[PDB]
């Protein structure tokens, strides 16, 4: 029935991003996706803490996908035999069948193919969502992501002027609920089944013991750490599908931030810390004008410190004087 | 003194919403309205646990009332002897003496009427607010609700565009703390004083026991399911007096979302997710344009699924394909 | 090599302002100001609980910093012998080296210089940020403040129109961590670093004991209430540098509301509560209309009632009755 051009898309691991157009003269086109659901036991801390993880593609967050205004997203999800649960996805983008979850129910050994009309411009969630109890444990467990949605003419500032990143990041924000025993010290289970009684009654508590970023504490630092030159425009991408957040990079500012993260809509400017509510995604973009380390935090700085939610860019060039100076070097007090 | 025609209001349960007009020819009346203040101990979840509730008009939230800009609402509130408590209260729509709470406190027994002019168009809170640790008590027992003050010319999109709703339903959203004994299982009690003492401890460590729609678990489902119809434009009023809310419609979108509620300023367009400060009301409208239930609820899923904090809307319509289709059900995997 | 004229501002305590221009005819200037860490014992509510303080300039939140786009802020940063731990600076203001914070750690006895140019207009926050779990709670200990830079034009309403206030005050919000024994009582230490391990091991389960403005329950009521007449126009600072905020003027309205706190963009207007996020400030300015008593609260109102966040404004002036009136006094029912 629908005859237009397909096109297949390699997904990337987070906090990369595939391939893309900005601005593009293509029309829509059948933009063909594939997501492997990996259920899995994964180290979340530097002590070694391990959680019962439930992926799209084996990553926390799941991909990042990228289309255009009225192209046609056609998925192929894919939950093998190797998985003990059934599956589904839900896209905040899409409209109808709860988001496609009402047609995408996979038990282990099954595929379903499921196609969307991206009719709303954005930076949008999506999630797995089986029903009822299921929902936020699936979710709360790794089985989020994110899909952007872009105006064929690039992004604009609202003021009839585009937006052109040079790079784009996608930064998922996973908050986690891992129990602890009598002595105090984090449990480990041996199936998500086996988790899921202790793991609900602290959910209810709505406290979490682990906020991190692309699925561990200290991902993206070191080497991992996000980069940048003086003088590029760097697009980050924010999710949380369960929990509000308030991103803010440190020593920078957001100079055009979308916080509900839909395009169609101008952006705010010159922010210091926005906010992306729960079940949602939202977008910053800043111009690098110094050299060094930026903390990418939420700045519930005990989240950030404590409970694993910092990332790191290391930027090159060079320092500008002018914008700030040490006049004079710690000494003592007169 | 003020010589205004008179219009009397016959109030309505939520999530209905009393008939008006949006746009109108009218100019300025007194717009009278009646609450009366209504203890009494309700059950809140299918496994029956009960509250002891404190309401306006017998239901929680209290009812919508909707005026237009430059009205005055001329509101007699009335406590029973049969309650035990005094109360008053507190518009957030009101200019002056704590939104009319210093000028509405009443004993059982007793009825005041107060007025205020409709200065400012939005959907506010409303609530008791009787002073002193009594504040939060009272609101989160129920005893809240929103008014909505319209442009006389109904509401526009920022753009001159005029946006008219085929329907609107007011969803409020209670947080409410239910104390546990030793068992772990939910205390009764035989008064709202002699809930008070554990309530009040339970409520200073800010985690509710239950986040529910219209008073209880399940409220808008089944039989008292929302509904639309495919091309059905539908306002959804969202109000929260004491904690924040993120509401989403599974399936669809906020095509025009006014979250912090107030008409003055241009709707966003093409939500996922909006939020709703604790101790507001927003405004969100939708075109439904597929047929099928979608849930109606707050995007910290745990609250949603796991807390109460979920409607249904059920749509009757014809099924687009353009927009989502399923290409292949599920099979086995190749 | 900047040669530009020299001021020196002296700070004043919150919820003061230092005497400042709002439109000005000047140009870029050097302006000076000096901060002094406090770390001090400090009693925190009308019970006696004390707290282990840590502040700028003796302050909880630290003095309001006015200056202008454009302008030069140089900063001394002293940290007295009489002090226990490193501490620093950093500006959200700022552009670099983490907002100043990876060139202002001084230990006892020293003092650094640090000067940022004022390139964002808007209300930030600025904080210690010492590294690592310090960053919390160096934070929560008190050590928070704010800064204004202002359009050289003063403020606009974002439709040509001037914006100007009458007075501003400064309100900043703290979140406090204060442990319990098995008693029940809130626990007493004799030195910030004894305070340390109990009070991270609270923060990390991310609900405070306490929520203050301007470091103390009932610090802004009775004879330090804030105070207005009927016809002024005041504007209203409010940081929370770790946690939301949801601002509320009980008997009020936000007219013109920058709740994202910065004048890049147009406020937003007529607001019932607006939401401050953690890590940032806001700003709201109304006119006031009527005299009596209002409460600025946080509309959490367990927060505002029970855990101290509530200020106090007495206004002096006529009663107007078209905006409000008690059209009949308690009575008995009919
Ligand atoms: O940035 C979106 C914002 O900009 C405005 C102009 O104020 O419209 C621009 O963006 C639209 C969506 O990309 C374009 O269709 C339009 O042509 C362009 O002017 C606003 O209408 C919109 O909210
Ligand atoms: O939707 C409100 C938003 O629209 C603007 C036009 O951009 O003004 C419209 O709405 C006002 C309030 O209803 C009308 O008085 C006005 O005539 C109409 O253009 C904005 O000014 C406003 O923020
Ligand atoms: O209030 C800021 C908002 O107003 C606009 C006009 O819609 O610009 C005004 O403010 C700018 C910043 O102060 C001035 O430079 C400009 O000249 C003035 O019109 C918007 O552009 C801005 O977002
Ligand atoms: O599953 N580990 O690559
Ligand atoms: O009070 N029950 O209808
Ligand atoms: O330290 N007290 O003023
Ligand atoms: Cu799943
Ligand atoms: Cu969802
Ligand atoms: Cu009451
Ligand atoms: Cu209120
Ligand atoms: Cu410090
Ligand atoms: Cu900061």
């Given at each position: 029935d629908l005859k237009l051009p397909r096109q297949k898309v390699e997904l990337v691991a987070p906090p990369f991003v595939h391939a893309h157009e900005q601005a593009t003269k293509q029309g829509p086109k059948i933009v063909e996706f594939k997501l492997t659901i990996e259920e899995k036991k994964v180290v979340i801390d530097e002590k070694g803490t391990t959680f019962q993880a439930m992926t799209f593609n084996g990553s926390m967050p799941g991909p990042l996908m990228v289309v255009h205004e009225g192209d046609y997203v056609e998925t192929t999800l894919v939950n093998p035999a190797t998985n003990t649960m059934p599956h589904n996805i839900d896209f905040?983008?899409?409209?109808g069948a709860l988001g496609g979850g009402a047609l995408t129910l996979i038990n282990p050994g099954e595929q379903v193919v499921?196609?969307?009309?991206?009719?709303?411009?954005?930076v949008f969630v999506y999630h797995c969502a089986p029903g009822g109890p299921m929902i936020p444990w699936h979710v709360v467990s790794?089985?989020?992501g994110a899909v952007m949605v872009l105006p064929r003419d690039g992004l604009n500032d609202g003021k009839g002027h585009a937006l052109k990143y040079d790079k784009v990041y996608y930064v998922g924000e996973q908050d986690m609920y891992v129990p602890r025993d009598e002595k105090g010290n984090f449990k480990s289970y041996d199936s998500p089944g086996?988790?899921?009684?202790?793991?609900?009654?602290?959910?209810?508590?709505l406290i979490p013991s682990?906020?991190?970023?692309?699925?561990?504490?200290?991902?993206?630092t070191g080497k991992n750490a996000l980069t940048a030159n003086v003088g590029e425009?760097?697009?980050?991408?924010?999710?949380?599908?369960?929990?509000?957040?308030?991103?803010?990079?440190?020593?920078?500012?957001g100079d055009y931030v979308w916080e509900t993260g839909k395009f169609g809509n101008a952006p705010?400017?010159?922010l210091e810390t926005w906010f992306i509510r729960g079940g949602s995604a939202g977008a910053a973009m800043y111009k690098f004008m110094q050299p060094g380390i930026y903390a990418y935090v939420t700045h519930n700085l005990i989240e950030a410190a404590d409970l694993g939610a910092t990332a790191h860019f290391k930027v090159e060039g060079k320092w500008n004087d002018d914008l700030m100076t040490q006049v004079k070097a710690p000494a003592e007090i007169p």
């Open positions: 905040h983008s899409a409209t499921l196609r969307w009309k991206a009719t709303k411009t954005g790794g089985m989020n086996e988790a899921f009684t202790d793991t609900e009654e602290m959910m209810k508590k682990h906020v991190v970023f692309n699925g561990k504490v200290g991902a993206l425009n760097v697009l980050i991408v924010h999710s949380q599908a369960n929990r509000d957040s308030r991103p803010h990079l440190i020593g920078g500012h705010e400017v010159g």
